[PDB]
Design a protein around this ligand. Sequence first.
Ligand SMILES: OC[C@H]1O[C@H](O)[C@H](O)[C@@H](O)[C@@H]1O[C@@H]1O[C@H](CO[C@H]2OC[C@@H](O)[C@H](O)[C@H]2O)[C@@H](O[C@@H]2O[C@H](CO[C@H]3OC[C@@H](O)[C@H](O)[C@H]3O)[C@@H](O[C@@H]3O[C@H](CO[C@H]4OC[C@@H](O)[C@H](O)[C@H]4O)[C@@H](O)[C@H](O)[C@H]3O)[C@H](O)[C@H]2O)[C@H](O)[C@H]1O
Length: 346
Amino acid sequence: TYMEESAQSAVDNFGLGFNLGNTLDANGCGTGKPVATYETFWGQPETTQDMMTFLMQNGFNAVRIPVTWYEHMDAEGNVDEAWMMRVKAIVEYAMNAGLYAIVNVHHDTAAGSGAWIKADTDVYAATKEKFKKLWTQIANALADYDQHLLFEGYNEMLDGNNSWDEPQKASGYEALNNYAQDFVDAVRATGGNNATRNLIVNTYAAAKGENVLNNFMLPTDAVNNHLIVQVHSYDPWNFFNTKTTWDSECHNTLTEIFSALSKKFTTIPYIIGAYGTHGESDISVSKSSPAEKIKLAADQAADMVKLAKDHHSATFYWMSIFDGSDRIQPQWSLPTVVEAMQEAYN
Ligand SMILES: OC[C@H]1O[C@H](O)[C@H](O)[C@@H](O)[C@@H]1O[C@@H]1O[C@H](CO[C@H]2OC[C@@H](O)[C@H](O)[C@H]2O)[C@@H](O[C@@H]2O[C@H](CO[C@H]3OC[C@@H](O)[C@H](O)[C@H]3O)[C@@H](O[C@@H]3O[C@H](CO[C@H]4OC[C@@H](O)[C@H](O)[C@H]4O)[C@@H](O)[C@H](O)[C@H]3O)[C@H](O)[C@H]2O)[C@H](O)[C@H]1O
């Protein structure tokens, strides 16, 4: 049954979080394909109940489920039923396991081909009703799940030039804030559990700089304390390639970031919805990385988790700790990183 819970309480209960990345967010194989074709298109196995249960049994309490939607929508913006039901099926795995789950709209945003949601005046005007129709469908299909399920409006919205970190024009902020409101409006309108469900709105590019935070506007909500703000972090940029250890510069950089977020968001919680070692050319840590590089990954994660706890936040690891064939066993890909995260959190 449904038990209404505040945004801050949800974030406090997330504990250690994980991103089921390159899975339902995988895209580019075209329209009209079997569900499993999309899900495995980027090298991940089909998700199982055992995976969600594994996370719960091993000290994690929340999973983010990225979803890319555009290849599953027809000309009128209707979502393929098999796709929607597969999203629902994976949510159900997570609910069964006792996890919090986040469902979003992922590579429909940002710099890849097929992205259609953009912080741009013309694009917003042309896609606003399509966007609201999408969220109405998602909210209705997932309506029956309780407070452990959250919706996240959009992943990493960029302007027309795909400008990371910050938009080139201030109108970009208008478009984002407008989308954000449309997202909240469309979900709340469906009523039921969606009337009070905790929802997540991301900053421009999910970035964290001074201008992006100052020009972020939280949507108006008829109910209290059911909104969360989300940002991402691979800071300091390219540290995995340029650093030999998680040094004082790395540590101070993270400390400053959390300080800036907590100073900005005084009354609403924020989360680090995706973080990791991914840097230039998306080079990232794996089990075949040198021990010093795996230690570098572990120290980042340890610091990220502890700072987040200190700042009444929560974190979701992007992919690397639980990846590919390791999901099938299931087993951690990076046990030492996870152990560092668990020790930091507990
Ligand atoms: O960067 C870290 C994270 O940062 C934020 O949190 C983001 O929200 C996360 O999404 C992001 O995660 C990374 O996302 C990458 C996708 O980004 C793209 O879309 C968003 C845009 O903004 C961005 O600019 C785009 O680059 C994701 O990259 C994908 O990785 C897949 C798997 O690759 C892994 O396994 C295979 C191995 O060889 C790789 O070294 C290893 O990294 C790639 O899968 C392959 O895809 C091709 C088909 O590719 C076509 O269609 C997809 C399109 O993206 C390609 O450009 C196009 O050629 C298929 O034939 C192969 O069999 C697959 O292996 C995928 O192509 C690639 O985009 C990244 O891994 C993830 O960390």
